[PDB]
Amino acid sequence: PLELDDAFMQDPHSVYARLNAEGSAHRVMMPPGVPVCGGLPVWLITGYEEVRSALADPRLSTDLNRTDRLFAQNEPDRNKRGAFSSALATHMLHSDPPDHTRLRKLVNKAFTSRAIEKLRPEIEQITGELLAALPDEDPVDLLDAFAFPLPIRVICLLLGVPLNFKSWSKALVSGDSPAATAAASTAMIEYLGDLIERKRRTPTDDVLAALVSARDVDDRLTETELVSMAFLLFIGGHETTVNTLGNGTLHLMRNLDQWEALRQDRSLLPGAVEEFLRLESPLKHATFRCATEDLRIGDTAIPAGDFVLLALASANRDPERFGDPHTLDVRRPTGGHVAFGHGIHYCLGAPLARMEAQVAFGVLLDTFPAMRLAVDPEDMRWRTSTLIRGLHSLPVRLN
Ligand code: HEM
Numbered sequence: 536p537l538e539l540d541d542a543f544m545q546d547p548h549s550v551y552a553r554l555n556a557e558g559s560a561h562r563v564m565m566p567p568g569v570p571v572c573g574g575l576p577v578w579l580i581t582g583y584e585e586v587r588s589a590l591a592d593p594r595l596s597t598d599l600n601r602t603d604r605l606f607a608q609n610e611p612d613r614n615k616r617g618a619f620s621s622a623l624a625t626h627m628l629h630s631d632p633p634d635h636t637r638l639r640k641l642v643n644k645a646f647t648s649r650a651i652e653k654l655r656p657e658i659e660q661i662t663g664e665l666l667a668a669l670p671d672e673d674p675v676d677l678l679d680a681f682a683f684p685l686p687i688r689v690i691c692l693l694l695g696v697p698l699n700f701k702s703w704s705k706a707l708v709s710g711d712s713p714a715a716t717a718a719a720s721t722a723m724i725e726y727l728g729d730l731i732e733r734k735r736r737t738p739t740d741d742v743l744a745a746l747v748s749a750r751d752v753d754d755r756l757t758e759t760e761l762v763s764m765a766f767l768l769f770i771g772g773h774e775t776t777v778n779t780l781g782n783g784t785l786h787l788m789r790n791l792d793q794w795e796a797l798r799q800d801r802s803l804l805p806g807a808v809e810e811f812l813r814l815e816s817p818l819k820h821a822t823f824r825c826a827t828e829d830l831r832i833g834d835t836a837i838p839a840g841d842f843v844l845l846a847l848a849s850a851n852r853d854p855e856r857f858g859d860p861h862t863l864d865v866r867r868p869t870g871g872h873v874a875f876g877h878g879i880h881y882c883l884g885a886p887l888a889r890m891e892a893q894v895a896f897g898v899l900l901d902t903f904p905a906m907r908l909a910v911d912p913e914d915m916r917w918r919t920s921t922l923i924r925g926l927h928s929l930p931v932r933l934n
């Protein structure tokens with residue numbers, strides 16, 4: 536079992552190309568000090584065809600009950616597993632089809648492509664304020680000033696929350712210590728419980744309140760599932776979109792001609808966003824899946840009960856599927872990326888994220904069109920996360 540080091544967190548693509556050149560399935564381990572999944576042997580899947588097939592393979596399950604066996608090797612206590620604690624992870628993504636359907640139906644109509652379009656005025660409003668609210672300095676740290684607040688402000692609008700989230704999701708996704716993520720985990724179930732009582736005591740009109748009604752009036756939901764669904768909607772949408780803005784901006788700042796070509800022609804913005812998603816996927820990996828029977832990935836047999844990690848970044852930079860996979864081309868044919876997954880678990884917030892990215896980048900080209908990176912591209916570091924691909928900071932100069 537190959538042990539993955541920090542150098543993998545910094546250039547995972549180089550490791551994937553190495554591994555994919557030899558095969559499609561490789562037994563790996565995350566460093567021992569990764570807070571929850573550290574030291575746990577899994578199969579890393581490299582390769583578009585193999586990753587895209589594996590995502591929708593009926594023999595690979597995301598069930599929390601099945602993945603319990605993986606996490607129990609580190610922490611037997613089901614509620615001490617971070618964002619994989621049962622009080623927070625018992626949602627649609629960690630369920631199989633009979634219950635996945637029910638859970639997704641509670642909220643699918645509110646994340647529809649048509650539904651999300653109605654929010655364009657509010658999102659544009661928030662984007663304009665956020666970039667007007669920050670200082671005028673040589674380094675701005677666009678990640679913390681702009682990239683983090685935008686999705687959480689939008690998500691809070693959809694789930695009824697007025698104006699701590701940034702630090703919490705950072706501890707969950709990229710925690711310094713197991714204690715740091717365990718601390719954030721406890722604080723989240725505490726906060727989510729308080730928020731649910733706030734909805735019961737004073738009913739309102741939003742997704743969260745509608746979810747509370749579905750639990751009490753209609754019994755469509757369980758109490759654990761209700762809390763976990765709130766967590767999934769809250770955290771699930773936040774870390775993803777911030778790194779899209781961050782990862783896309785970095786790559787744009789490294790290829791200024793493509794950045795200006797966007798400023799010149801805005802019709803390329805939708806396709807450019809998908810190219811950011813392909814090149815630097817906010818999630819390098821999908822959730823852990825369990826093999827419910829023996830199956831063969833590539834040329835290697837995966838025994839029943841083993842656990843599998845799908846490298847979405849590896850699939851999105853596979854030369855058999857994408858030409859010049861490591862080069863940013865905003866004019867590249869669009870479609871085919873697996874940044875949102877594939878199969879029944881295809882991201883429900885995909886329409887919302889796409890609109891968020893389009894508005895934020897479009898304003899960023901209108902305002903501060905001459906902004907540039909404040910450091911050398913190579914001194915930028917990436918955070919330590921099993922699934923997330925995001926930067927520690929993104930200093931820029933605007934003028
Ligand atoms: C750049 C933005 C985003 C990316 C790259 C992304 C990525 C993904 C991926 C790859 C999956 C499937 C994981 C797997 O199959 O193992 C997924 C599922 C999911 N995502 Fe996202 N996501 C993004 C934004 C959002 C947002 C904004 C929300 C909500 C506000 C959201 C909520 C969800 C939910 C609920 C699921 C589970 C769907 C299901 O189980 O049917 N995501 N996401």
Ligand SMILES: CC1=CC[C@H]2O[C@]1(C)O[C@H]([C@H](C)/C=C(C)/C=C/C(O)=C1/C(=O)C=NC1=O)[C@H]2C
Pocket residue numbers: 569570571572617618619628707708709710716770771772774775818820821822919920921922923
């Ligand atoms: C794969 C996922 C797809 C959809 C949602 O749900 C998963 C689990 O993720 C996402 C959030 C951002 C949460 C993450 C990445 C939680 C990470 C986590 O629990 C970690 C550790 O404990 C140590 N490294 C980690 O990355 C979120 C979009």
